[PDB]
Amino acid sequence: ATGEPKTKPTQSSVRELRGCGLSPDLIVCRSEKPIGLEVKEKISNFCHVGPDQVICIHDL
Amino acid sequence: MKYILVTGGVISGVGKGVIASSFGTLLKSCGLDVTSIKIDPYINIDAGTFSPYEHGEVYVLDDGAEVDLDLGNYERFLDVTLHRDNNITTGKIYKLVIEKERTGEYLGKTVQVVPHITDAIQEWVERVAQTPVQGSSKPQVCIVELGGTIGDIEGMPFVEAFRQFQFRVKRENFCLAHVSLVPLPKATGEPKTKPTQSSVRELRGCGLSPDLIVCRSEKPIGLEVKEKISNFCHVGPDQVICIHDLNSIYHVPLLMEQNGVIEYLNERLQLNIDMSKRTKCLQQWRDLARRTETVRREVCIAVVGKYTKFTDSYASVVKALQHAALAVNRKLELVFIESCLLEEETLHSEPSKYHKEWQKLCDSHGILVPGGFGSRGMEGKIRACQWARENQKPLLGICLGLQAAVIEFARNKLGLKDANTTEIDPNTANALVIDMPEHHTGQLGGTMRLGKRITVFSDGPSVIRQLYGNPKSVQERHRHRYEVNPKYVHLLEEQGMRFVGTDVDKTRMEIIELSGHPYFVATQYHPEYLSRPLKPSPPFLGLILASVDRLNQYIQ
Amino acid sequence: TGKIYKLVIEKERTGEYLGKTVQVVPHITDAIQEWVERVAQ
Numbered sequence: 001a002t003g004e005p006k007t008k009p010t011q012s013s014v015r016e017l018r019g020c021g022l023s024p025d026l027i028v029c030r031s032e033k034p035i036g037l038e039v040k041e042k043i044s045n046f047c048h049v050g051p052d053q054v055i056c057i058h059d060l
Numbered sequence: 061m062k063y064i065l066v067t068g069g070v071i072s073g074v075g076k077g078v079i080a081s082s083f084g085t086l087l088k089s090c091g092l093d094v095t096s097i098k099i100d101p102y103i104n105i106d107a108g109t110f111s112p113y114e115h116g117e118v119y120v121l122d123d124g125a126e127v128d129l130d131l132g133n134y135e136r137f138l139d140v141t142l143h144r145d146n147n148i149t150t151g152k153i154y155k156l157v158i159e160k161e162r163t164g165e166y167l168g169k170t171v172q173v174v175p176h177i178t179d180a181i182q183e184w185v186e187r188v189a190q191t192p193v194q195g196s197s198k199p200q201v202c203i204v205e206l207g208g209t210i211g212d213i214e215g216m217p218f219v220e221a222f223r224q225f226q227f228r229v230k231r232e233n234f235c236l237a238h239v240s241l242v243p244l245p246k247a248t249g250e251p252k253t254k255p256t257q258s259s260v261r262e263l264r265g266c267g268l269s270p271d272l273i274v275c276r277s278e279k280p281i282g283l284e285v286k287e288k289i290s291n292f293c294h295v296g297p298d299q300v301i302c303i304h305d306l307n308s309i310y311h312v313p314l315l316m317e318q319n320g321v322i323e324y325l326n327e328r329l330q331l332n333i334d335m336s337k338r339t340k341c342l343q344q345w346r347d348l349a350r351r352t353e354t355v356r357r358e359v360c361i362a363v364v365g366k367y368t369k370f371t372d373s374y375a376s377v378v379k380a381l382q383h384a385a386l387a388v389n390r391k392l393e394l395v396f397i398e399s400c401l402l403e404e405e406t407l408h409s410e411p412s413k414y415h416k417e418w419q420k421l422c423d424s425h426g427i428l429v430p431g432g433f434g435s436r437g438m439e440g441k442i443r444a445c446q447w448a449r450e451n452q453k454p455l456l457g458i459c460l461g462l463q464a465a466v467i468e469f470a471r472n473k474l475g476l477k478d479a480n481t482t483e484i485d486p487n488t489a490n491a492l493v494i495d496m497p498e499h500h501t502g503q504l505g506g507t508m509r510l511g512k513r514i515t516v517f518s519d520g521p522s523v524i525r526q527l528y529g530n531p532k533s534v535q536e537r538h539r540h541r542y543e544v545n546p547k548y549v550h551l552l553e554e555q556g557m558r559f560v561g562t563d564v565d566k567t568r569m570e571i572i573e574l575s576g577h578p579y580f581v582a583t584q585y586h587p588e589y590l591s592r593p594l595k596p597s598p599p600f601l602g603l604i605l606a607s608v609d610r611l612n613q614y615i616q
Numbered sequence: 617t618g619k620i621y622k623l624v625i626e627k628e629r630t631g632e633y634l635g636k637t638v639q640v641v642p643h644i645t646d647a648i649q650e651w652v653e654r655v656a657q
């Protein structure tokens with residue numbers, strides 16, 4: 001329906017973890033299908049991690 | 061006045077717009093007058109400076125305002141003419157408050173968020189709720205949709221404003237439907253209620269409480285998940301509504317009616333709706349859904365566009381094509397074609413994709429070249445127009461498609477191989493499409509030819525004139541900044557083309573048509589913005605009829 | 617606050633953020649940090 005990977009739940013989870021006092025050093029993104037470069041860039045920009053700190057594991 | 065607030069769960073593509081439009085449809089079927097206010101917590105004044113990828117296709121109103129596609133959905137489902145005040149952004153509220161503070165309305169106290177920004181938001185909502193929108197109709201229910209999800213930094217002022225607003229107008233006049241997502245991952249295999257519980261916890265911490273929980277999934281969720289949501293959201297079993305992905309959005313009002321939403325809202329908001337009279341209320345939507353289910357004949361239209369990576373970037377165009385396909389009892393097979401892959405540069409890089417897209421274009425009954433901005437993909441549109449004109453394939457170009465058609469005609473028939481648009485090639489020997497002088501003041505955003513205009517039919521038999529109903533002039537909405545150049549106009553007209561659409565001044569050409577070719581129509585305005593489920597846009601209807609070789613029969 | 621929001625709205629109305637959604641975290645905070653950088657120096 002939406003037809004695109006959504007990064008908002010991960011942003012909210014990172015915000016909650018930081019408000020709890022912990023800043024992620026890696027972020028593992030679980031998806032059914034591989035996400036594009038722009039999705040990882042959005043994750044890095046809005047969850048405030050480097051582009052290489054966003055690990056993307058899909059349904060192997 | 062009664063209010064329904066539709067908030068978002070974990071994502072912003074969950075379906076709040078469709079849920080709000082279905083609320084409006086259900087209430088207007090009963091007999092009420094429904095207003096719709098879209099709240100966009102972004103700081104942009106309007107949606108005219110948005111890419112189609114950001115949130116979908118940009119909608120243009122009668123007064124020129126460029127807004128979200130949610131307002132397009134509201135107009136399509138409710139058949140109402142919205143205004144600029146029906147969209148509330150953060151930028152609008154802050155600009156209003158800053159202007160008031162500068163003038164001196166707030167003299168004496170500092171201007172804050174909670175006492176001033178939220179007060180301005182509540183004043184805006186109350187004032188625009190009462191503004192007539194369908195004529196002399198005085199609204200009874202206002203459906204406010206909050207863009208985004210609960211928990212965003214931009215949405216905190218609006219959530220606090222509505223937390224105060226529910227007590228300002230009493231709870232009997234205020235309801236809240238929360239729309240959430242229930243993901244079902246393949247690895248886990250089970251619907252997950254945790255994000256909905258998190259959303260409800262956040263919305264309760266913010267001071268509100270969902271009267272309804274609308275759970276969105278791809279497939280119907282089992283009763284265990286629904287009961288878990290009812291248990292962990294402190295709402296009753298019958299206050300959780302499960303809406304899955306349906307074949308069309310005409311099924312959403314029917315599904316919500318089957319779920320007892322109308323009765324719950326009548327009891328919760330004291331709407332005093334009578335059930336005995338409200339029988340066969342949604343007959344139009346039931347008929348439309350049945351027709352969408354039972355269409356067998358196939359019509360294939362190739363959309364040669366540049367924003368095909370996101371399918372909602374052409375939402376209004378797809379809806380107009382669907383309306384035209386249903387108006388002639390045809391099933392619409394829509395094949396999006398990236399115009400970049402049709403260019404010769406793609407041939408030397410991805411020959412497989414080049415030939416695949418070209419055989420996609422050659423196997424369709426009709427071609428549609430939509431509008432757009434920038435120079436990327438323009439050559440693909442010109443190549444598609446050339447193929448359509450050479451092979452007698454019907455083509456309907458919109459805005460940027462008219463410029464591409466004019467450029468192709470000048471380059472091929474007139475021999476001007478350097479013909480181009482100033483938007484793309486400012487240093488052009490033969491500038492076939494030039495910029496309009498009064499829309500290039502260096503201030504992007506609300507500075508084009510926006511909204512309803514007047515287009516005059518030329519003196520001469522044209523089938524596009526007959527499609528509209530043999531009028532003398534028509535009023536259509538524009539969103540363009542560049543125009544066709546007069547002398548080239550003249551030359552081309554002489555050659556093989558007929559500029560059959562102009563304005564009152566008879567200088568700005570809007571509609572072109574070709575002698576010979578069965579259907580080659582290009583317009584400067586957007587016909588999709590005025591398309592309604594029972595009122596298909598005449599250009600799209602003509603394109604469909606020419607594609608299925610039924611235009612001549614429809615003429616007589 | 618008023619200065620920052622007025623500055624961002626005026627920038628957006630000209631086309632400095634052409635094509636993107638102007639938000640708080642990427643844009644208001646960037647304006648605040650750019651203000652601090654240009655004033656401190």
Ligand SMILES: Nc1nc2c(ncn2[C@H]2C[C@H](O)[C@@H](COP(=O)(O)OP(=O)(O)OP(=O)(O)O)O2)c(=O)[nH]1
Nearest residue numbers: 108109110111112432433434435436504541634635
């Ligand atoms: N390029 C352009 N965009 C405008 C203009 N006026 C309003 N807008 C809007 C439409 C565009 O979607 C948005 C610009 O963002 P983008 O550059 O990402 O869209 P565009 O269609 O140009 O795609 P592209 O740049 O070729 O990748 O601003 C204009 O005069 N030129």
Ligand SMILES: Nc1ncnc2c1ncn2[C@H]1C[C@H](O)[C@@H](COP(=O)(O)OP(=O)(O)O)O1
Nearest residue numbers: 001002072073074075076077078304305306
């Ligand atoms: N119940 C449903 N079944 C199938 N598709 C749906 C649906 N509800 C919405 N959609 C489609 C239509 C929209 O283009 C897209 C979501 O956009 P939307 O309805 O405007 O939601 P939002 O306002 O949250 O962005 O998904």
Ligand SMILES: [Mg+2]
Nearest residue numbers: 072073115116
């Ligand atoms: Mg949306």
Ligand SMILES: [Mg+2]
Nearest residue numbers: 076077130205
């Ligand atoms: Mg919406």
Ligand SMILES: [Mg+2]
Nearest residue numbers: 072113114115
């Ligand atoms: Mg987004």
Ligand SMILES: [Mg+2]
Nearest residue numbers: 433434435635
């Ligand atoms: Mg651009």
